[PDB]
């Protein structure tokens, strides 16, 4: 979130408040404690773009995918989840984009929905079962992916 507001305030400064930004993006309330973080970025210069190039393809996507899925044998849960989408997204007229342009806006669209979802379900992780605080000793076991 902080790397996005570092790019908003570089072009238009009035939309980002330093009293609002460096107050809830520098404290991490976890395990009854807080932790300070040393941040002035360059590592997250692609997730700020992959999540934003995905950010506009979802509202066009979840109406093009729902106009095709309507029939006598719709799965009954999407009768409920049809209403959660806002009213302005329900008025996207897809006449302004052609059909061989819409395919280019799906194979791009789905490929970010996977490759952003996969890099947090990547599991070089290890389950600690014993620990002591004043010795910094710990034992665990490893389970990949």
């Amino acid at each position: 979130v902080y790397h996005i507001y570092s790019k908003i305030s570089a072009g238009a400064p009035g939309d980002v408040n330093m009293a609002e930004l460096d107050l809830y993006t520098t404290n991490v309330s976890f395990m009854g404690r807080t932790y300070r973080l040393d941040v002035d970025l360059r590592v997250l210069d692609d997730l700020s773009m992959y999540l934003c190039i995905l950010s506009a393809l979802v509202p066009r996507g979840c109406l093009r995918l729902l106009t095709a899925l309507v029939r006598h044998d719709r799965h009954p849960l999407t009768e409920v989840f049809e209403g959660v989408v806002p009213d302005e997204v329900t008025r996207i007229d897809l006449d302004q984009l052609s059909v061989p342009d819409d395919i280019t806006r799906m194979r791009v669209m789905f490929s970010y929905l996977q490759s952003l979802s996969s890099i947090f379900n990547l599991g070089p992780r290890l389950h600690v079962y014993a620990y002591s605080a004043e010795t910094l000793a710990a034992s665990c076991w490893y389970s990949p992916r």
């Binding site: 009768e79 409920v80 049809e82 209403g83 959660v84 806002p86 009213d87």
Partner: peptide, 8 residues
Amino acid sequence: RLSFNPVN
């Protein structure tokens, strides 16, 4: 709040 508008 997220609005809920089903078919009726």
